[PDB]
């Protein structure tokens, strides 16, 4: 699974 702290600027729920 993706690491959401790889880039803190990315909101994974924003589509």
């Amino acid at each position, epitope marked *: 699974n*993706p690491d959401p702290n*790889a*880039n*803190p*600027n*990315v909101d994974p*729920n*924003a589509n």
Partner: antibody, heavy 120, light 114 residues
């Protein structure tokens, strides 16, 4: 939204360098500042990020022993300090708001880059 | 680390011809839970920092011309320029933000045959 970096520098092999990155056009504490370097002819190499608000960091394995990333919220500036420089560290150093993807906005902003040359 | 491998290293086609750049990730960058691929495409001209063109492997950044399009899922990705323009001469990089460290492809240089 802009990032403005300090000027190019020469440092001797073994010395340290500190590059600044002044942010404008947004609330500085909202996003993470990344540092990425680009050697002449080589690809982009990510070094680390700093949360401009709480100051937490994540460093790449290559640079952990010699990089320090800090920020000054009052001055809206992030800094990268690389120590024990080698010729292999001669490169353009960019600060960047990489892939800011939020619910209602998506953008990506880079500084102009700071050329650091390791040389006597 | 997630190696990003681009092919070809260089590309030359005529004005208005279609250009294809391939990017393969050393591991799968698709997340079934949100059906997203954690891939961006960048454009770099000499003297300037890279410019974001595509994110989530296929969402164009605002202002980017529609002749740029991203496709693929998992490990095999494509950046297509449907009709090359003279201003599109540049080096193109893919980028993954699935996991740490963040990584970039080796770049693909796009030239015009005239």
């Amino acid at each position: 939204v802009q990032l403005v970096q300090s000027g190019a520098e020469v440092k001797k092999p073994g010395a340290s360098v500190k590059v600044s990155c002044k942010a404008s056009g947004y609330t500085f504490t909202r996003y993470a500042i990344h540092w990425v370097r680009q050697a002449p002819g080589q690809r982009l190499e990510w070094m680390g990020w700093i949360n401009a608000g709480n100051g937490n960091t994540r460093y790449s394995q290559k640079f952990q022993d010699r990089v320090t990333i800090t920020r000054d919220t009052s001055a809206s500036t992030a800094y990268m300090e690389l120590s024990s420089l080698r010729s292999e560290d001669t490169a353009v150093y960019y600060c960047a708001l990489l892939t800011v993807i939020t619910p209602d906005d998506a953008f990506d902003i880079w500084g102009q880059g700071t050329m650091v040359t390791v040389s006597s | 680390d997630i190696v990003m491998t681009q092919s070809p290293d260089s590309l030359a086609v005529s004005l208005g011809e279609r250009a294809t750049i391939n990017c393969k990730s050393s591991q799968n960058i698709f997340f079934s839970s949100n059906n997203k691929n954690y891939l961006a495409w960048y454009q770099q001209i000499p003297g300037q920092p890279p410019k974001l063109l595509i994110y989530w492997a296929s969402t164009r950044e605002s202002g980017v011309p529609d002749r740029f399009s991203g496709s693929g899922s998992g490990t095999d990705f494509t950046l297509t320029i449907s009709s090359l323009q003279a201003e599109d001469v540049a080096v193109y990089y893919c980028h993954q933000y699935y996991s740490s460290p963040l990584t970039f492809g080796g770049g693909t240089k796009v030239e015009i045959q005239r």
